[PDB]
PDB file of C-alpha atoms in Angstrom:
ATOM      1  CA  UNK A   1       2.827  34.147  57.003  1.00  0.00           C
ATOM      2  CA  UNK A   2       0.619  31.065  57.311  1.00  0.00           C
ATOM      3  CA  UNK A   3       0.893  28.432  54.580  1.00  0.00           C
ATOM      4  CA  UNK A   4       0.768  24.728  53.730  1.00  0.00           C
ATOM      5  CA  UNK A   5       4.364  24.479  54.944  1.00  0.00           C
ATOM      6  CA  UNK A   6       3.522  25.721  58.439  1.00  0.00           C
ATOM      7  CA  UNK A   7       0.972  22.905  58.615  1.00  0.00           C
ATOM      8  CA  UNK A   8       3.947  20.551  58.913  1.00  0.00           C
ATOM      9  CA  UNK A   9       4.263  21.483  62.587  1.00  0.00           C
ATOM     10  CA  UNK A  10       0.814  19.958  63.071  1.00  0.00           C
ATOM     11  CA  UNK A  11       2.295  16.504  62.477  1.00  0.00           C
ATOM     12  CA  UNK A  12       4.307  17.016  65.665  1.00  0.00           C
ATOM     13  CA  UNK A  13       1.036  16.672  67.573  1.00  0.00           C
ATOM     14  CA  UNK A  14       1.313  13.160  69.010  1.00  0.00           C
ATOM     15  CA  UNK A  15       0.349  13.794  72.635  1.00  0.00           C
ATOM     16  CA  UNK A  16      -2.875  15.524  71.599  1.00  0.00           C
ATOM     17  CA  UNK A  17      -5.259  15.939  68.663  1.00  0.00           C
ATOM     18  CA  UNK A  18      -5.473  19.737  68.684  1.00  0.00           C
ATOM     19  CA  UNK A  19      -2.023  20.056  67.115  1.00  0.00           C
ATOM     20  CA  UNK A  20      -3.197  17.525  64.529  1.00  0.00           C
ATOM     21  CA  UNK A  21      -5.699  20.110  63.292  1.00  0.00           C
ATOM     22  CA  UNK A  22      -2.859  21.933  61.540  1.00  0.00           C
ATOM     23  CA  UNK A  23      -2.680  18.896  59.260  1.00  0.00           C
ATOM     24  CA  UNK A  24      -5.388  20.619  57.219  1.00  0.00           C
ATOM     25  CA  UNK A  25      -2.722  23.060  56.038  1.00  0.00           C
ATOM     26  CA  UNK A  26      -0.789  20.185  54.498  1.00  0.00           C
ATOM     27  CA  UNK A  27      -3.485  20.049  51.829  1.00  0.00           C
ATOM     28  CA  UNK A  28      -1.867  23.180  50.397  1.00  0.00           C
ATOM     29  CA  UNK A  29       0.792  20.923  48.880  1.00  0.00           C
ATOM     30  CA  UNK A  30      -1.551  18.082  47.930  1.00  0.00           C
ATOM     31  CA  UNK A  31      -3.603  20.309  45.627  1.00  0.00           C
TER      32      UNK A  31
END
């Protein structure tokens, strides 16, 4: 059940950039 909310976990990516990719999901809210 992917969604803009699940993209929040992407913000937890601080040790790497891969996890930061999920940030794209955040756009779901900012739209």
